[PDB]
Amino acid sequence: SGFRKMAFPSGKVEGCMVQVTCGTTTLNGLWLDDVVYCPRHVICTSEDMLNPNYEDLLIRKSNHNFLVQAGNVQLRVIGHSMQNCVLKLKVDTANPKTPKYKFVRIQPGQTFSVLACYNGSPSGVYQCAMRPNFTIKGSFLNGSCGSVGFNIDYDCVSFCYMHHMELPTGVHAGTDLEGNFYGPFVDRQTAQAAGTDTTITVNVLAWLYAAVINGDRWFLNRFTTTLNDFNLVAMKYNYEPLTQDHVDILGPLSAQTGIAVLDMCASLKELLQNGMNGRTILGSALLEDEFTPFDVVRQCSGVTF
């Protein structure tokens, strides 16, 4: 019993964190085999950020301009290249702690664990989701650039995010491990703003099924809805449209609890209309959207209370 915002154990990722320094800038890097991956803005000054020409800044650098530190050991840089917004530093030593891994690009609504780091040293781990507007609501301070997001399903680490910047509203933007940004953002200090955010509907539904599994049904009703009528109502509360893919993905949770997806959609419509009236759902007074259908199946029991 119980339901917590749970992160993956961070050990496999802690053994990859390093400190990268270029001149006066210091940030984090990910050391996998003989390559260290880090944001390419490590080569910029604060002035350069307005309109940086990364190719022009990088051509003026040599391998020995990059200082890489792993614990108390200085690694030697033997090569360097840029791939999109990521800098790849070839080092002379393969990381002996390299786990089994993949680079995966996630879609909005997907969740992941963040190992926040400063000076190549891990400070904390938390769980979060890729918002529909492609930002993440993280907890990051200056020096956290290069911190990574990941999932560890089975024994393989799937790296999906690398931290690059904080937007004016306090939310965060970054790239996959191939250097492609999530969202219409650029590693440049320009007037960039997060688009209007929405609630991840498929995740709220999954969390309502988790509450049913744990033994709570106060929010259910005798009604159903069509998918079109649900979406017409949902978009009035800034909820993402629910697609047929989302309905399909919720199938196993629907069969385990005995409540059809469109039946759960009717409970959601009513919760949006009435509020909670002093009640909570899994210890929360708001509708939670940072648990995917997959996270619910992973954390909850296979036997409904």
Ligand X SMILES: CN(CCO)S(=O)(=O)N1Cc2ccc(Cl)cc2[C@H](C(=O)Nc2cncc3ccccc23)C1
User: What residue ranges bind ligand X (CB under 6 A)?
Assistant: 1, 41, 49, 140-142, 144-145, 164-166, 172, 187-189
265 belongs to the catalytic site: no
Sequence-ordered list of residues with C-beta below 8 angstroms from that of 262, at least 6 positions apart, any chain: 224, 225, 226, 227, 230, 247
16 belongs to the catalytic site: no
CB 238 within 8 A of CB 199: yes
**Residue 173 binding a second copy, by CB under 8 A:** no
Q: 205, 231, 220: which is closest to 292 by C-alpha?
A: 205
**Which residue's CB is nearer to a second copy, number 52 or number 120?**
120
Q: 235, 302, 293, 294: which is closest to 264 by C-alpha?
A: 293
2 binds, among a second copy, Cl ion, ligand X, none (CB under 5 to 8 A by kind): a second copy
Cβ atoms < 10 Å from Cβ of 4: 10
Output DSSP code: residue 3. Answer: -
CB 113 within 8 A of CB 53: no
**Which residue's CB is nearer to a second copy, number 258 or number 302?**
302
Return the residue of 41, 170, 212, 242 that touches a second copy, per CB under 8 A: 170
Sequence-ordered list of residues with C-beta below 8 angstroms from that of 84, at least 6 positions apart, any chain: 175, 178, 179, 180
Binding region for Cl ion (CB under 5 A) out of 106-114, 172-180, 204-212, 221-229: 106-114
**Which residue's CB is nearer to a second copy, number 73 or number 303?**
303
Q: Of 145, 160, 265, 300, which residue is the catalytic one? A: 145
**Residue 110 binding a second copy, by CB under 8 A:** no
Q: How far is the CB of 128 from a second copy (least distance, A)?
A: 7
**Residue 249 binding Cl ion, by CB under 5 A:** no
Residues marked active site are found at 41, 145
